[PDB]
Amino acid sequence: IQRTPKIQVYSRHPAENGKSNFLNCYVSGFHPSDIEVDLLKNGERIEKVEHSDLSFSKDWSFYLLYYTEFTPTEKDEYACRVNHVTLSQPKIVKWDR
Amino acid sequence: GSHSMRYFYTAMSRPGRGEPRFIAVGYVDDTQFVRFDSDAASPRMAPRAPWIEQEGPEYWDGETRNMKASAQTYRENLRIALRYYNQSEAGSHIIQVMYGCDVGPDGRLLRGHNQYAYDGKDYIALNEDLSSWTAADTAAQITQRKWEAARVAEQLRAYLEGLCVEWLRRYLENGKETLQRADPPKTHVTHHPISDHEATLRCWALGFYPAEITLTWQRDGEDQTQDTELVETRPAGDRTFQKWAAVVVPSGEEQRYTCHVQHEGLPKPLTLRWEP
Amino acid sequence: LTVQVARVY
């Protein structure tokens, strides 16, 4: 009946401190389609994140890309936080350059 | 090479929260080009790729009318499926549909597709002959008997061999700068010790299109399939995709490992190693 | 271009 999301957090281009980039959180493999995804900058939710139009794979499971412009620095920590019916509590995956 | 057009519809009920949401997206290969979302402030078929933008108002208006009509039909099918599965009206359920056509380099139809799911499981599928159906269970056999009585497969076959192929050929021409360009992967290998006697080697592919790619690790010339961690291919957001494959190897044996990359954008497969 | 047949179950 239900399938839990796979989550990857990564950048559009290889990261260089002080250079504009995009931070991505790709959630995939999940069913049903309702999902809650936040991007976090130092534990705090980033506003106005955009996401792709809902689509699905050959095995019917859904995927979405959430993304926002960002400028990596040495200090700042980034993460993706995902909730879904299959999850007891939000799962947080940290960005690792 | 060969190319495909696919549309994907999802219809999600939400009792107590209004009528079911209907979303449709269309793709040529791995490039999305249209979307429709019944929950938008003003639902219409909207462009998502630059080469579709040149279609005129008759196209956008027709596609919008068709998506509204389809959304009404799929809302009805969700009611129907509830009865077919003896389910209560309290729950939320999902219908998904995918259909479309695949053409070879000369533009001739290679094969057509029309397949339906209910709650993420197969429900009914048009077979490759485009003339018979495979139903996944007794509920879907009720639909099968109705579609057989109405000769639905004949109408789909006519779309799949006709308009589907014709419109895909048109999109391929209008988008030829991108839909007909493969970008090969930029590849490299990274090395990170995990302990004094093991290290991870990770072979990266970035910036490639289309999404299909094969990344394999060999040790002494033999594939390390059972031992390789492969992440799902993921979208960069600028049309291209990324992937990596990793293997854990004994310290001092790194040079026995080679990463092999196959992609449509490469003239020949690539072999790379960790270069300290 | 999408298909016009949307069929009832």
Coordinates of C-alpha atoms in Angstrom, one line a residue, chain B:
Chain B
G1 CA 18.5 8.1 -31.7
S2 CA 15.1 6.9 -30.7
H3 CA 12.7 9.2 -28.8
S4 CA 9.5 8.9 -26.8
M5 CA 6.6 11.1 -25.8
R6 CA 4.8 10.3 -22.5
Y7 CA 1.9 11.9 -20.6
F8 CA 1.5 11.1 -16.9
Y9 CA -1.8 11.9 -15.0
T10 CA -2.4 11.6 -11.3
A11 CA -5.9 12.0 -9.8
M12 CA -6.0 12.0 -6.0
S13 CA -9.2 12.0 -4.0
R14 CA -9.3 13.8 -0.6
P15 CA -12.7 13.3 1.1
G16 CA -13.8 16.3 3.1
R17 CA -11.3 18.5 1.2
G18 CA -13.1 19.1 -2.0
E19 CA -13.0 17.3 -5.4
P20 CA -10.0 15.1 -6.4
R21 CA -6.9 16.9 -7.5
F22 CA -5.9 16.2 -11.2
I23 CA -2.3 16.9 -12.4
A24 CA -1.1 16.0 -15.9
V25 CA 2.5 16.5 -17.2
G26 CA 3.9 15.7 -20.6
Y27 CA 7.5 14.8 -21.5
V28 CA 9.5 14.3 -24.7
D29 CA 12.3 12.0 -23.6
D30 CA 13.5 13.4 -20.2
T31 CA 12.3 16.9 -21.0
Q32 CA 9.0 18.1 -19.4
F33 CA 7.1 20.3 -21.8
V34 CA 3.6 20.9 -20.5
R35 CA 1.7 20.8 -17.2
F36 CA -1.9 21.0 -16.0
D37 CA -3.0 21.3 -12.3
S38 CA -6.6 21.4 -11.3
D39 CA -5.6 23.1 -8.1
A40 CA -3.9 26.1 -9.8
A41 CA -5.6 29.5 -9.3
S42 CA -6.5 29.4 -13.0
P43 CA -6.0 25.8 -14.4
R44 CA -4.8 25.5 -17.9
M45 CA -2.3 23.5 -19.9
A46 CA 0.8 25.6 -19.6
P47 CA 4.3 25.4 -21.3
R48 CA 7.3 24.1 -19.5
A49 CA 9.9 24.0 -22.3
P50 CA 10.8 26.8 -24.7
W51 CA 10.1 25.0 -28.0
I52 CA 6.4 24.4 -27.1
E53 CA 5.8 28.1 -26.5
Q54 CA 5.4 28.7 -30.2
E55 CA 2.2 26.7 -30.4
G56 CA -0.8 29.0 -30.9
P57 CA -3.9 29.7 -28.9
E58 CA -5.9 26.9 -30.6
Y59 CA -3.3 24.5 -29.2
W60 CA -3.4 25.8 -25.6
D61 CA -7.1 26.2 -25.6
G62 CA -7.8 22.7 -27.0
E63 CA -5.3 21.1 -24.5
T64 CA -6.8 23.0 -21.6
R65 CA -10.4 21.9 -22.6
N66 CA -9.2 18.3 -22.9
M67 CA -7.4 18.4 -19.5
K68 CA -10.6 19.7 -17.8
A69 CA -12.7 17.0 -19.5
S70 CA -10.1 14.3 -18.5
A71 CA -10.1 15.6 -14.9
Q72 CA -13.9 15.2 -14.8
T73 CA -13.6 11.7 -16.2
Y74 CA -10.9 10.6 -13.7
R75 CA -13.0 12.0 -10.8
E76 CA -15.7 9.7 -11.9
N77 CA -13.3 6.8 -12.3
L78 CA -12.2 7.3 -8.7
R79 CA -15.9 7.0 -7.6
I80 CA -16.2 3.9 -9.8
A81 CA -13.0 2.2 -8.4
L82 CA -14.3 2.8 -4.9
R83 CA -17.3 0.6 -5.7
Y84 CA -15.2 -2.0 -7.6
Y85 CA -13.0 -2.5 -4.6
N86 CA -15.8 -2.3 -2.0
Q87 CA -14.1 0.7 -0.3
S88 CA -15.5 3.3 2.0
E89 CA -15.9 7.0 1.1
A90 CA -13.7 8.0 4.0
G91 CA -10.4 7.2 2.4
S92 CA -8.1 9.0 -0.1
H93 CA -7.1 7.0 -3.2
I94 CA -5.1 7.7 -6.4
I95 CA -5.5 6.8 -10.1
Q96 CA -2.4 7.2 -12.3
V97 CA -2.3 6.9 -16.0
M98 CA 0.8 6.9 -18.3
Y99 CA 0.6 6.7 -22.1
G100 CA 2.5 7.7 -25.2
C101 CA 4.6 6.4 -28.1
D102 CA 8.3 5.5 -28.9
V103 CA 9.8 6.2 -32.3
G104 CA 13.0 5.1 -33.9
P105 CA 15.6 7.4 -35.7
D106 CA 13.4 7.5 -38.8
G107 CA 10.3 8.5 -36.8
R108 CA 8.5 5.2 -37.3
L109 CA 6.5 3.9 -34.3
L110 CA 8.4 1.4 -32.3
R111 CA 5.7 0.8 -29.7
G112 CA 2.7 2.5 -27.9
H113 CA 1.8 2.5 -24.2
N114 CA -1.5 3.0 -22.2
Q115 CA -1.3 1.8 -18.7
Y116 CA -3.4 2.6 -15.5
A117 CA -2.8 2.1 -11.8
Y118 CA -4.9 2.3 -8.7
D119 CA -3.3 3.1 -5.3
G120 CA 0.1 2.6 -6.9
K121 CA -0.6 -0.9 -8.1
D122 CA -1.2 -2.0 -11.7
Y123 CA -4.9 -1.8 -12.7
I124 CA -5.2 -2.4 -16.5
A125 CA -2.8 -2.0 -19.4
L126 CA -3.1 -1.9 -23.2
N127 CA -1.0 -4.7 -24.5
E128 CA 1.8 -4.2 -27.1
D129 CA -0.6 -5.3 -29.9
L130 CA -2.6 -2.1 -29.1
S131 CA -5.7 -4.2 -29.4
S132 CA -6.1 -6.3 -26.2
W133 CA -5.9 -5.6 -22.5
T134 CA -4.3 -7.1 -19.4
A135 CA -6.3 -6.5 -16.2
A136 CA -4.6 -7.0 -12.9
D137 CA -7.5 -8.2 -10.9
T138 CA -11.3 -8.9 -11.0
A139 CA -12.2 -5.2 -10.6
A140 CA -10.1 -4.3 -13.6
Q141 CA -11.8 -7.1 -15.6
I142 CA -15.0 -5.2 -15.2
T143 CA -13.4 -2.2 -16.9
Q144 CA -11.9 -4.6 -19.5
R145 CA -15.3 -6.0 -20.4
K146 CA -16.6 -2.4 -20.8
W147 CA -13.7 -1.3 -22.9
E148 CA -13.8 -4.4 -25.1
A149 CA -17.6 -3.8 -25.7
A150 CA -16.9 -0.1 -26.6
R151 CA -13.8 -0.9 -28.8
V152 CA -11.6 1.5 -26.8
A153 CA -8.4 -0.2 -27.9
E154 CA -9.1 0.7 -31.5
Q155 CA -9.4 4.4 -30.6
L156 CA -6.2 4.3 -28.6
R157 CA -4.3 2.5 -31.3
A158 CA -5.5 5.2 -33.8
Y159 CA -4.1 7.9 -31.5
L160 CA -0.8 6.1 -30.8
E161 CA 0.0 5.3 -34.4
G162 CA -1.3 8.6 -35.7
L163 CA -1.4 11.9 -33.7
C164 CA 1.0 10.7 -31.1
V165 CA 3.8 9.9 -33.5
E166 CA 3.0 13.0 -35.7
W167 CA 3.1 15.4 -32.8
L168 CA 6.2 13.8 -31.3
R169 CA 7.9 14.3 -34.7
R170 CA 6.8 17.9 -34.7
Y171 CA 8.2 18.5 -31.2
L172 CA 11.5 16.9 -32.1
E173 CA 11.9 19.3 -35.0
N174 CA 10.9 22.4 -33.1
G175 CA 13.1 21.4 -30.2
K176 CA 15.9 19.9 -32.2
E177 CA 18.6 22.1 -30.6
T178 CA 18.0 20.4 -27.3
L179 CA 15.8 17.3 -27.7
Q180 CA 18.3 16.1 -30.3
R181 CA 21.5 16.9 -28.4
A182 CA 23.0 14.5 -26.0
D183 CA 25.3 16.1 -23.4
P184 CA 27.9 13.6 -22.2
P185 CA 28.8 13.2 -18.5
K186 CA 31.7 15.0 -16.9
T187 CA 33.3 12.2 -14.9
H188 CA 35.7 11.9 -12.0
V189 CA 36.7 9.5 -9.2
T190 CA 37.0 10.6 -5.5
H191 CA 38.8 8.6 -2.8
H192 CA 38.1 8.9 0.9
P193 CA 39.6 6.6 3.6
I194 CA 37.0 5.2 5.9
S195 CA 39.6 3.5 8.2
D196 CA 43.3 2.5 8.0
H197 CA 42.5 -0.5 5.8
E198 CA 39.5 0.6 3.7
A199 CA 38.7 3.4 1.4
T200 CA 35.6 4.4 -0.6
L201 CA 36.1 5.1 -4.3
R202 CA 33.2 7.0 -5.8
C203 CA 32.8 7.5 -9.5
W204 CA 30.8 10.6 -10.4
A205 CA 28.9 11.5 -13.6
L206 CA 27.5 15.1 -13.8
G207 CA 25.9 17.3 -16.4
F208 CA 24.6 14.6 -18.7
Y209 CA 21.4 14.3 -20.8
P210 CA 19.5 12.2 -21.4
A211 CA 19.1 10.5 -18.0
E212 CA 19.9 7.0 -19.1
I213 CA 23.5 6.1 -18.1
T214 CA 25.5 3.0 -16.9
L215 CA 28.1 3.4 -14.2
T216 CA 29.9 0.2 -13.2
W217 CA 33.0 -0.6 -11.0
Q218 CA 35.2 -3.5 -11.9
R219 CA 37.9 -5.0 -9.7
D220 CA 40.6 -6.8 -11.7
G221 CA 38.3 -6.6 -14.8
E222 CA 35.3 -8.1 -13.2
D223 CA 32.0 -6.3 -12.4
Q224 CA 31.4 -5.6 -8.8
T225 CA 27.6 -5.5 -9.0
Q226 CA 26.7 -7.0 -5.7
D227 CA 29.2 -4.8 -4.1
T228 CA 28.5 -1.4 -5.6
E229 CA 26.3 1.3 -4.0
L230 CA 24.5 3.1 -6.8
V231 CA 22.4 6.2 -6.1
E232 CA 19.3 6.9 -8.2
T233 CA 20.0 9.2 -11.1
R234 CA 18.9 12.7 -10.0
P235 CA 18.0 16.0 -11.8
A236 CA 20.4 18.9 -11.5
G237 CA 17.6 21.4 -12.4
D238 CA 19.2 22.8 -15.5
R239 CA 18.0 19.9 -17.7
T240 CA 20.9 17.6 -16.9
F241 CA 21.3 14.6 -14.5
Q242 CA 23.8 13.4 -12.0
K243 CA 24.7 9.9 -10.7
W244 CA 27.4 8.2 -8.7
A245 CA 28.6 4.7 -7.9
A246 CA 30.7 3.8 -4.9
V247 CA 32.7 0.7 -3.8
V248 CA 34.6 0.1 -0.6
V249 CA 38.1 -1.2 -1.3
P250 CA 41.0 -2.4 0.7
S251 CA 43.7 0.2 1.2
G252 CA 46.5 -0.2 -1.2
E253 CA 44.3 -2.0 -3.8
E254 CA 42.8 1.2 -5.3
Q255 CA 44.4 0.7 -8.7
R256 CA 42.8 -2.6 -9.2
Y257 CA 39.5 -0.8 -9.5
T258 CA 38.2 0.9 -12.7
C259 CA 34.9 2.8 -13.3
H260 CA 33.2 2.3 -16.6
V261 CA 30.8 4.8 -18.0
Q262 CA 28.4 4.3 -20.9
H263 CA 26.2 7.2 -22.1
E264 CA 24.6 8.1 -25.5
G265 CA 26.8 11.3 -25.5
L266 CA 30.0 9.4 -25.5
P267 CA 31.4 8.0 -28.8
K268 CA 32.9 5.1 -26.8
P269 CA 32.6 3.9 -23.2
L270 CA 34.9 5.6 -20.7
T271 CA 37.2 3.9 -18.2
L272 CA 38.5 6.0 -15.3
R273 CA 40.5 5.3 -12.1
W274 CA 41.4 7.2 -9.0
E275 CA 44.3 9.5 -9.9
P276 CA 46.1 10.4 -6.7

